[model samples]
Target: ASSSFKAADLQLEMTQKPHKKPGPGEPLVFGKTFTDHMLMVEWNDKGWGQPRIQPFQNLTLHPASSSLHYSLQLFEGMKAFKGKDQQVRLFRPWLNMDRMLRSAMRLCLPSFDKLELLECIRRLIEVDKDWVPDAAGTSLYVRPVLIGNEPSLGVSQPRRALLFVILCPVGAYFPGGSVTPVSLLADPAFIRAWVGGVGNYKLGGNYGPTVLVQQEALKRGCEQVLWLYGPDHQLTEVGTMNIFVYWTHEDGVLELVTPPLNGVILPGVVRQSLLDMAQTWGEFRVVERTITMKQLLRALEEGRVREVFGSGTACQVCPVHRILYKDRNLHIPTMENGPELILRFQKELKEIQYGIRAHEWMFPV
Candidate 1:
């Protein structure tokens, strides 16, 4: 617990005015641009320090910072969408804060109130509300990063930590955009996460190791890596997103299946929201369980695999067109004539995000 920490005490030191806003003609790249202001808070051995929103600038860290040496850092990806009515809305941001709190606990960092941090973030977004793009399919991307600042090289928990939030106006995650289905390289050699590892946490270390394999996939004409695990080669995650498959059972029942959170897969907010939304409709069976590649291939062979997609805050719902397995190119039918389920999920989810549909998940700053 931080004895001196209070979200209500957050201080704001804004920039002079505003920089150039992203116009409709400008190519809004994901995470390439930033707003004028950012929110930062620090914690030391004593307790948490004053939270401040200041001008976006470079961070100063010691040479032997633990975050640099031991990779003691974590981050959360979220966004604020501009509504049709010109209001800025955040989609289920509290869930990101909750997950971030869990990640901080995993890294043995100082504990702070989740709601308070959320309030601080909301205030930061409110300050940079204009940075939220008004153009369709564009949004203000929010990245909240926490890092260990202890200037030591020991393999112990850090005594100092920093939590900061930055905002970027992003158009789409993929090059051609989110609607374009992507191809994946399903290689069993490169493993993403393990059973007892920090795979469930949004840690920087969990992602850095996968960059090489991702590049390898790109060389093979694939957009992302369909990460597989174990001797059975269980389908875990599609690139950075949680994997989902809509299929028809042997009994002719429509079902949606995804890898269960068995300490390996990330508990994605969008993944859970889609599951909840589908279950609420009760139109199809939603099952959370492990699905081996053999089982999925068998279903595909029987023409039961209806659609495959990846869900995350970045892409929302990315349809999987093809999976390049060992030697065979397994073509998924999700992209044929446009993926029905993926498109439906994207539309409904975006409607809520853009404030076209009123829901509790949409938080106004």
Candidate 2:
């Protein structure tokens, strides 16, 4: 009954057959590939067991694992950036740990010490450091997963669980890279998340259901779904990222606005950074509240829209150039202004991520 331990309690088992690393300029799909190793740990009636750095291998599970049937799974996405100086670093991983912890709580999963989990992840990245790509617009994507692994069919909590981390070297999320703007299909027919739901967390259930709606978007000739909610059609998110609008208010004051954390939006790390940076710059009004499709359309009709973008770990900041809502193909001027804020956000975050600009958020692995 005394099995709980700290990050210092990890065992390293390197892979016997190392994978040939992806060569320079090779097309690394978003989540298809993996590094030579992964980090794993288990939890049971006793408590969380010691962590391990082990060879990347397939997981064996019971046929009746609770997660397989009841959707008791959660995951987080963070990245490790390789600087020009050849140092590997992670961007604001503690924030990710906190989010994952909140997600675990929401699903009644076993909670963990945030600092210890982050330490294990850092060490995992250290062992797979060579796989961290250094090419422009690339980083080592970190995915941490927690699942209810108890082998039973009852709709109850897991008496046993598994926590694991995997790393993937990823290229640009958007094929044409950051400068290209993505169009959206804003339809109310499909809802991604709703109020009083687990939308605020990074749980698996929230994402898998959106794939169908995303495909519908593509069929409609849009890159992503401009997820909307409520009867008045309030803007919630863009596919997986948080949505934002930069516009001039009625009083002629420029403002940068995004939907508040009102229970339907994922509190993205990049979204938080943009808010923090904008407020720090003290250049324009920064507001966190709801913006409806009706209001946005009015502003667009009045030529008040300056820029609209989506923010998340995968894309940092993706500009929105067009929205296909109903019969209208609404055009956003995000790219016309040199996307003043979009390009700036990308540059600032890139500098911080690659350690080009010294910051506390960049944790060297």
Candidate 3:
């Protein structure tokens, strides 16, 4: 078995997909579909081996694989932009890599050369550069996933694993050229994550269980779920997205409220960026602290809950139209505030991504 990674030993079996770029009203949804080529590297306790930049294809895993069984998997979601110069730029690719490194360590998965993995990913992007959608509001969605592929049924750390990067050419998570505010279903009965748990990290172990709850929300006719915590019933996040509530407190102070990372929330890259960027705008005071559901509902009744939105890599900012609580619909006034900031953030972020604006976010390969 190979003890290290080598680019030349990597074998690429090419298979191209029928390709076309964005045309009109079509906006790319993140991870909705994927490109033809992908990045892959296999590893084991024997140490990491050859890296491959290959065509996207199905992976055959044992029926009792650890990844599918004990949930020994993790991933990072990031984007690559097609600049005006006909070049592709990844927004802080190192951030994604760093996060993946932590996830790998936490999952007890064997580590590979991060630089070598980065090189393989760069080669994948270079090979499929045309797949980088040129539309202004579009980008190449980059997903790096590490999973245990060991065949044994034991619940121990896996010796065999696979790390792969896939790209999806997407437009925007919220399309229609108009932001239709979202509605949330508050569920304190369930918890998304907790202290001393893997919640603070990105793991595939965290997502599967949430889908059943999401299906339950759909059965109840709600667009998304508002995750509530504790007996005081504090708000955590909105449907796997970092949450934001804008309102003027009874004391006549306007503030943006987000859940503090007291080891309960996922420290998302997009979430952190928004908090940093909003300060420069200097419109409303931004605060990252816990706010209870009682306060939010009371403010809404008093006509003070200005707007609510969810932030993440997918939608950046998803407007919350209403929250379903105790079989009643509590609507937020996000539409009244307009989606100006959402549009502005999208535009500014796009400009930075496409090299139209000089920002430190983009990393050119």
Candidate 4:
């Protein structure tokens, strides 16, 4: 009761017969095929149980598990890239650890040391190192999930929690060698999150509701939804990531603006990285201003808008080509104008990610 166990307490059990690894030539879908091993750590009122690295298998939860009933769950998205040097590295995983901790606290889930948890993940990655894809534009996706497993159906704080980590070797999100722009459906009729919502946290509650909204985006011929907030019509985020807009200020200055980490922003790892990396370059002013749709409309017509993109652990950087907002097809010339900033960010980040250059952001495992 006095302390939680260190990563040294983690037990390991390897499977005698391994599942056939995904071949480089075969098509690999995101989260479609999983590695043969996973990391599991159970928690209850008494204390944390023995953290273990075991064969991937299904979990046995009570039919009335709170996570199933009330959506008491949170998860993190991370990746381990296999560089040209043939070594695997985790990209700024500490940020994911911090975000997951914040999410657990919000849901009244048990807390544990971040370092211990990260070390456990490292070991799990090593045990299944062969599962990481070596092809260019490919990497292993890491997902850490925490859910309330308490059996009672009442809407109360959970006493038991199940935290697990899984791995998936995913191919490039864009199969084409070039970065293509995505069109969005900006329907104020449907919003992803708001002030009273847990949008800042990576909770399941924040995501599960967006499925139908995404379906609506497809129906309207857009790839994803551009979530608008409040009566002010400020653009909060894109479908599953943070949004950014780069345009020329009326005062003849270049400005890059994204929504601030208010109650509704996800504070994505890549979002912060792009901001930090851009600030270091000192090329333009980076800001966290709430950009409204009407403001963007005026800027686009005035020929001031430069580039618009979405940042996340999954896409890393996605260029936006158009937005279908209020029965208008507002075109965003992000990729058409040689989008140096977006393209540069993509190349610069990939340098450290794929071990082309050494940086503290990439933790070699």
Model 3 lDDT tens row, 1-365: 12267565667767665456555675555566788888888887667767787778898898989999899999988887887788888887776777788888898887666666667787788787888877656778888899998899999889899888898888755454455677788978878887788887899877888898888888888878888878889888888899888888768999877889976788877777778888778998888988898998889989988778888777777888888888888878788776656666667776677899877877785
Residues 127-153 of candidate 4 have per-residue lDDT tens digits of 999999878778999999999999998
For model 1, which pairs clash? none
Where does candidate 3 have its weakest 10-residue lDDT segment? 1-10
Model 3 ranges with Cα > 4 A deviation = 1-32, 113-115, 282-284
Q: For residues 13-49, what per-residue lDDT tens digits would candidate 2 score against the true structure? A: 9899899988776688889989999999999998888
Q: How much is the lDDT of residue 330 in candidate 2?
A: 94
lDDT scores in order = 0.88, 0.90, 0.80, 0.90
Candidate 4, residue 346: how far the Cα is off, in Å: 0.7
- Candidate 4 versus the native: TM-score? 0.98
Q: Which residue pairs does candidate 4 place in steric collision?
A: none
Q: Candidate 1 or 3, higher lDDT?
A: 1
Per-candidate TM equals: 0.96, 0.97, 0.89, 0.98
Q: Choose 2 or 3, whichever is better by TM-score.
A: 2
In angstroms, give how far residue 289 of model 3 lies from its true place: 0.4
Models, CA RMSD each: 1.6, 1.7, 3.0, 1.3
lDDT of 1 by residue, 1-365 (tens): 54356778988898996788877776876788899999999999767888899999899999999999988899999889988778988889889988998898899877788888888888999889888886767888899999999998897899999999999999866544447888999999999999999899999999998989999999998999999999999999998999999998667888999999998999999999999999988888999989889988998999889899999988888888899998688999887735788878878987899988899999987
For model 4, where is the 10-residue window of minimal lDDT?
1-10
Off by over 4 Å in 2: 1-4, 174-178
lDDT of 3 at 29: 54
